[PDB]
Design a protein around this ligand. Structure first.
Ligand SMILES: CC(C)(C)[C@@H]1CCc2[nH]nc(C(=O)NN)c2C1
Length: 294
């Protein structure tokens, strides 16, 4: 924008490019997302503008939504690092368990809030999770994919990651439930613990089959109505569920049982964020400070 001094290209989200910018009128530095266009739908703008009221300590504040010159700008509070970069930076040593637990806990808190307000994220991923030096982690781009419908690619024609996509989305479910975010967070929790993505699919079917290979091909027994889903094919290979202790070693039993609940196939059996906050895994949760290299 004309009111800002680009500092760096924070990155390039699925919807446009993101810039670290200083408000040459307030001096505060923000993350400025520029969105892609014959007029632009006002249905999507009111939905996003509603996100400005969704304020919580574990949600990146959406400062402004500006629609001008066929461009949509989203002004976000700036955090110094995303979880994907922090995980890469901790690749050799791994993120300490107390910090992983604190991060999971805070994210469930952020989700409990969004979901209690009927707002779903729909595209949770490490790059969407921002952390600060004080030990806080925050959800960002909350409710964005809603009024926009996830595009096959991004602005730079890169590639949308499906690694954190819930099985019902992959099977063509028309309606998303808050359960999709719990699934994504479960995948992230496992990745923080093991230092490797849980389901690194590079296509929709590869994603699906990677899920099936590990948790077993779902059927009417574990997931009623699954065989009636849009993209469900009776021809799907039938993989036996893998022993779970193999999925996230060496995570303890409490962590493992919570993760299994976050990864139940049936969205109805999948644990809610609120219930998860009461899980015994969080009996000794604390708030460690990360060692950040800014
Ligand atoms: C749209 C994406 C890219 C997910 C974030 C929006 C808000 C934000 N705040 N700090 C950051 C940040 O990347 N700090 N370095 C971001 C980025």
């Amino acid at each position: 924008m004309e009111n800002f001094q680009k500092v760096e290209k924070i990155g390039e989200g699925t919807y446009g490019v993101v810039y670290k910018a200083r408000n040459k009128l307030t001096g505060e530095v923000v993350a400025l997302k520029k969105i892609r266009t014959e007029g632009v739908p006002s249905t999507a703008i009111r939905e996003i503008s509603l996100l400005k009221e969704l304020n919580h300590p574990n949600i990146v504040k959406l400062l402004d939504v500006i629609h001008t010159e066929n461009k949509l700008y989203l002004v976000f509070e700036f955090l110094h690092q995303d979880l994907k970069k922090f995980m890469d930076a901790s690749a050799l040593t791994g993120i300490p368990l107390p910090l992983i637990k604190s991060y999971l806990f805070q994210l469930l808190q952020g989700l409990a809030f969004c979901h209690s307000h009927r707002v779903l994220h729909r595209d949770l991923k490490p790059q969407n999770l921002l952390i600060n030096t004080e030990g806080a982690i925050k959800l960002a781009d909350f409710g964005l994919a809603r009024a926009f419908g996830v595009p096959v690619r991004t602005y730079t024609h890169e590639v949308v990651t499906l690694w954190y996509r819930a099985p019902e989305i992959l099977l063509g479910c028309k309606y998303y439930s808050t359960a999709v975010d719990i699934w994504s967070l479960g995948c992230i929790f496992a990745e923080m613990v093991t230092r490797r993505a849980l389901f690194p699919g590079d296509s929709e079917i590869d994603q699906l089959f990677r899920i099936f290979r590990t948790l077993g091909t779902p059927d009417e027994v574990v997931w009623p109505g699954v065989t009636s889903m849009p993209d469900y094919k009776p021809s799907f290979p039938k993989w036996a569920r893998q022993d779970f202790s193999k999925v996230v070693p060496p995570l303890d039993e409490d962590g493992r049982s919570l993760l299994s609940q976050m990864l139940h196939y049936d969205p109805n059996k999948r644990i809610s964020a609120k219930a998860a906050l009461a899980h015994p895994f969080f009996q000794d949760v604390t708030k460690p400070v990360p060692h950040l290299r800014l």
